[PDB]
Design a binder for this molecule. Structure first.
Ligand SMILES: Nc1ncnc2c1ncn2[C@@H]1O[C@H](COP(=O)(O)OP(=O)(O)O)[C@@H](O)[C@H]1O
Ligand SMILES: Nc1ncnc2c1ncn2[C@@H]1O[C@H](COP(=O)(O)OP(=O)(O)O)[C@@H](O)[C@H]1O
Ligand SMILES: Nc1ncnc2c1ncn2[C@@H]1O[C@H](COP(=O)(O)OP(=O)(O)O)[C@@H](O)[C@H]1O
Lengths: 735, 496
């Protein structure tokens, strides 16, 4: 099968001339590690780079960067033949010059700013006609090789010298501009970008495959998520990386036209892209296009909506165009467009986590340099409620504040700025911290979905419960055969009841990190908001959000909060039924049990829980968390004292003994109060950098137990009544 | 296509996309065009966007289009032999003007197919493609209970597409036209379908589904006295109409099931539907509370209307006393035992035709809080009590429950029947479930054997929790003896 052709893929390294290959793949060519490898693709262009080592890519594929893809004029999903070239080659005469599209507004020398700190200790086989991009000077600069010594036998070396004339050239449409968007500009979106990549590769890279076969490819791809996540960025990247014409249809642009012309624009926007097949049609916003929910106003709005509806289902094959749309509000779409044949694929993209946000900062700051004391790991923690677009504004403001601080007293009265000062302009912590304060997040009320970083090591004691939870949600998902053979269905959910403060939230958070699944948390007041607001239909969206974000786990904190609001222990003139829990019970019956979802219920008063949830089919597994013992309290303090270094004279084993009715949360404020004393005494004595023993002794005077003594017996009498394992001690058979 | 008549398709949004006047002319010109090509069939794609004259009351052209359609409907004074057809997803979203006689008098309600119906859809949509020997469509028709017929087409298309991305990914046949010697050899396995099942998002999971349960009388252990009473009440008037018409006495309207919870009142209602070859509609507890809390009791009219056209059918109401418990229960409140949800049911049961092949089954667990307004003759007179299972009946319950999973021969269920005294039918299901979980746990633990052992049931006895208490047991007996009261008149005879 000629094992010398490999499929291309996106590179994981930020370097330019790097080729990633696996160790088993590398020995198949019988080649060494440090050398030059020649790549032959299509369009009679060649490429030579440096091969590297990988261990987690695939069985057989090549991982190459975006800048090196432009030289070969190849895209993702294309085959390329790789052959070695073990020959020693040097460089004698090199003549390169950039294009005016990227060096417009730059004066001064063009050697010691971009050519010297690019080729030092690099040894890259720069081929004739290749296009490479240099990052630096807080901007993007790209060069090109016009003429040199006849290729091959050309490698940059310190012996040769670089010369440039000074006048730029004019580019053509043969090469693709590197300033456009690509697959390397997406951060955090890993699970959801793959679905779009696999759904679009086949009907675009191979248009003739679907033309001959009768399989119906998906037409509409509706996008979700709060504004600023990057729905337009993904739509443009998937069109630029697939060689398909991209057409952008703005929401207000249609509405700005008069009567009839807006109707003609949508009609003329389809056959225009049809001739340029393959093509991708993207709609910016749909709230202002089809708000047919409660408007019922305007004669042209319904006509435009119906015209769009007719243009959707009217694409009877013909071309191989794929239409895409993006809406921030999933609920603001008319059901007519959600019918099959118009919009059947739905992608929900949420707010990225800290790891995802760090990639956004790395992406938006790749063209600019940063000081040694500058780390992006810290800034990704405080911006928990920031959208991907907020980080772009944050870094832009941080870069701008540097000019107002360092370039304020200089006053270079020049018509064009130079480059010898712009590159030297560094950005520190003082520039970023000021921008953090000025930044106003635009997404803080929606339900965020994140995977907690807490593991089982951060939970002290309660080892009996951990095995029960690990044996209930991990076997049916990873041993499906033993469940299908016996035919018995897995459990739906679990209920956590017991005294408050034992850490019921931590048990639900830790099971999400072990299963590599999402986690959705609903607090107490979140349930009371719907009960007081007379709107119990808001929980349907909560249930629907968890379904598409598979796998996921659902958490309900203090479900008995509504019962306490209507009397609690004494109750009221009614029963234990309400309207918020009614919708949850109705939705749990209709949800598919075959999905990778789970529901966890937390409560502290089991005597006021509605018994309607305990019957088989909704919630049967009840887990009780008892009071921590002496042997378990040491581990709680040991896990809590991991974030701050402590001394060795702190005898936590002694503190474990006098604590009798202290719960898990009852010991956190003790440590917090002890730590506050260290800061207080350090600031007082400033006019030492370790916590002392005396801090804990003083905090013992304010040791307040959150749980009383009368309710302790009520949990024990409830547990013994629920278990009742008496009577049948040990029975045997005669034979 | 199968009758040799010209087919004309009229799309909903297609009419609306036109300007003023042209949309009026399209409907007019769409009729005589098909008239000359008689016979013909005129089909309308959607009617929600054509005649939404319910609460809109907006737009000047919408009413004109609706009236033009109305005039074109009743204006077909024979002439040709054209038949006009229309399709609407929402039965409630049609103006009553079109429902008048002469325009739309025939109504066909098509629902979500069952597993047997869904298997035929998979066979139809995969007849042109081949499948491996380990590929069976019987399993995939069970997990897709909430899937529409169009969802299965997308499911099989995605399953076929994923095979290309897995087998035709590293080949890279750079050819302008694909061949046939490789496409035929491309088989589809379980791994291709299971991936498509996860990615498929059903679009119909909130509506009331209608299905015929597969549970028969063999799956219900014991309670043989009740089964004959139910078989003698809903099967004779439907298959011996002559003996009912000759005597002139009307059949019973419905039955009420009361007793301790867990005895399996739902199974009794489900089994009678499979024997009579009729449909089955089930309404749970929270389904009734949704209308009581939402201040919208008119939603039950659609529930009643759905069962009528789906004849024959049976109607089931689980825990009808759920609303009474929400307002105080045993102690009650400042009001009586009347509410708004049951009021509409009582009003609708009076107006329903008794000659249809329909039946209503009521289930409850607290007979002391049931509104007496439903017990008076004409609505609900037959009351059936399900007592606690006896020792001889508990063996059959376990035998029927242990049919889905093969068990060993050393499991002596007759012994387990004896110490169980207050255990109901549902009280024994969790025992078997807990015993079966132990087998999986020990198999996975010892993996780093393929039969249930005796020791699994011994361990599950420690967590044997009875759902019913001991104080409420006497309340059912005292209620039953008060309701029956067959004392006094022992045996009377006549002198001649
Ligand atoms: N996830 C992301 N990664 C990188 N850049 C982003 C991301 N999301 C947004 N941006 C940047 O924010 C700018 C505005 O995006 P915007 O058009 O608001 O996205 P959307 O249309 O999805 O709201 C874009 O120029 C883009 O570069
Ligand atoms: N068993 C435990 N081990 C370690 N920390 C605990 C434990 N229980 C509680 N905590 C700590 O107490 C704090 C408050 O927990 P809390 O919200 O009261 O839990 P719950 O909601 O279950 O009552 C948490 O931040 C957690 O870190
Ligand atoms: N008499 C019985 N025979 C067999 N199984 C039963 C019986 N009674 C109950 N079950 C089982 O118990 C489970 C729960 O029934 P449940 O919903 O509690 O009935 P009900 O609604 O009448 O109380 C059912 O899945 C059923 O299989």
């Amino acid at each position: 099968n000629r094992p010398n052709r490999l499929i291309v893929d996106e590179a994981i390294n930020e370097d330019n001339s790097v080729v990633s290959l696996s160790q088993p793949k590398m020995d198949e060519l019988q080649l060494f590690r440090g050398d030059t490898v020649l790549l032959k693709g299509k369009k009679r262009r060649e490429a030579v780079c440096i091969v590297l080592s990988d261990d987690t890519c695939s069985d057989e594929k090549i991982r190459m960067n975006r800048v090196v893809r432009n030289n070969l004029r190849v895209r993702l999903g294309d085959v390329i033949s790789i052959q070695p070239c073990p020959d020693v080659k040097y460089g004698k005469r090199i003549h390169v010059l950039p294009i005016d599209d990227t060096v417009e507004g730059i004066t001064g020398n063009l050697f010691e700013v971009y050519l010297k700190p690019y080729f030092l200790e690099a040894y890259r086989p720069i081929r004739k006609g290749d296009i490479f991009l240099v990052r630096g000077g807080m901007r993007a600069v790209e060069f090109k090789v016009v003429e040199t010594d006849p290729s091959p036998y050309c490698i940059v070396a310190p012996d040769t010298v670089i010369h440039c004339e000074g006048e730029p050239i004019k580019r053509e449409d043969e090469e693709e501009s590197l300033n456009e968007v690509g697959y390397d500009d997406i951060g955090g979106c890993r699970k959801q970008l793959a679905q779009i990549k696999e759904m679009v590769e086949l009907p675009l890279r191979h248009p003739a495959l679907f033309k001959a076969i009768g399989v119906k490819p998906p037409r509409g791809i509706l996008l979700y998520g709060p504004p600023g996540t990057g729905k337009t960025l993904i739509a443009r990247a998937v069109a630029n990386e697939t060689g398909a014409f991209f057409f952008l249809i703005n929401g207000p642009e249609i509405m700005s036209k008069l009567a009839g012309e807006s109707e003609s624009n949508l009609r003329k926007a389809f056959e225009e892209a049809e001739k340029n097949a393959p093509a991708i049609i993207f709609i910016d916003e749909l709230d202002a296009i089809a708000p047919k929910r409660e408007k019922t106003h305007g004669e042209v709005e319904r006509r435009i909506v119906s015209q769009l509806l007719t243009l959707m289902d009217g694409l009877k094959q013909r071309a191989h165009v794929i239409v895409m749309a993006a809406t921030n509000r999933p609920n603001s779409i008319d059901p007519a467009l959600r019918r099959f044949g118009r919009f059947d694929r739905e992608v929900d993209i949420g707010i990225p986590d800290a790891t995802g946000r760090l990639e956004i900062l790395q992406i938006h700051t790749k063209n600019m340099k940063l000081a040694d004391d500058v780390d992006l790991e810290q800034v990704a923690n405080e911006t928990h409620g920031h959208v991907g677009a907020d980080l772009a504004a944050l870094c832009s403001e941080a870069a701008l504040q540097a000019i107002r601080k360092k370039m304020d007293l200089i006053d270079l009265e020049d018509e064009t700025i130079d480059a010898e000062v712009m590159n030297s302009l560094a950005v520190t912590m003082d520039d970023f911290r000021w921008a953090l304060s000025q930044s106003n997040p635009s997404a803080l009320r929606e339900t965020v979905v994140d995977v907690p970083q807490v593991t089982w090591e951060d939970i002290g004691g309660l080892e009996d419960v951990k095995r029960e939870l690990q044996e209930l949600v991990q076997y049916p998902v990873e041993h499906p055969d033993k469940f299908l053979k016996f035919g018995m269905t897995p459990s739906k959910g679990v209920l956590f009841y017991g005294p408050p403060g034992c850490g019921k939230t931590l048990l639900a958070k830790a099971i999400a990190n072990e299963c590599q699944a999402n986690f959705i948390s609903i607090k107490g007041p979140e349930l009371l908001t719907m009960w007081f607001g007379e709107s119990e239909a808001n929980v349907r969206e909560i249930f629907d959000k968890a379904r598409q974000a598979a796998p996921c786990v659902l958490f309900f904190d203090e479900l008995d909060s509504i019962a306490k609001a209507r009397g609690g222990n004494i109750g009221d003139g009614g029963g234990a039924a309400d309207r918020v829990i009614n919708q949850i019970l109705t939705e749990m019956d209709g949800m598919s049990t075959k999905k990778n979802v789970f529901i966890i219920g937390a409560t502290n008063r089991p005597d006021i829980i509605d018994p309607a949830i305990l019957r088989p089919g909704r919630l049967d597994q009840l887990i009780y968390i008892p009071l921590p013992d002496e042997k378990s309290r040491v581990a709680i303090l040991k896990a809590n004292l991991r974030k701050s270094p402590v001394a060795k004279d702190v005898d936590l084993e002694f503190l474990a003994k006098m604590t009798n009715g202290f719960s898990g949360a009852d010991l956190t404020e003790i440590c917090q109060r002890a730590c506050k004393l260290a800061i207080r005494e350090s600031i007082e004595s400033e006019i030492v950098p370790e916590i002392r023993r005396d801090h804990f002794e003083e905090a013992m005077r304010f040791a307040r137990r959150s749980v009383s003594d009368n309710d302790i017996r009520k949990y024990e009498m409830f547990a013994q009544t629920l278990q009742q394992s008496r009577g049948f001690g040990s029975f045997r058979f005669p034979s």
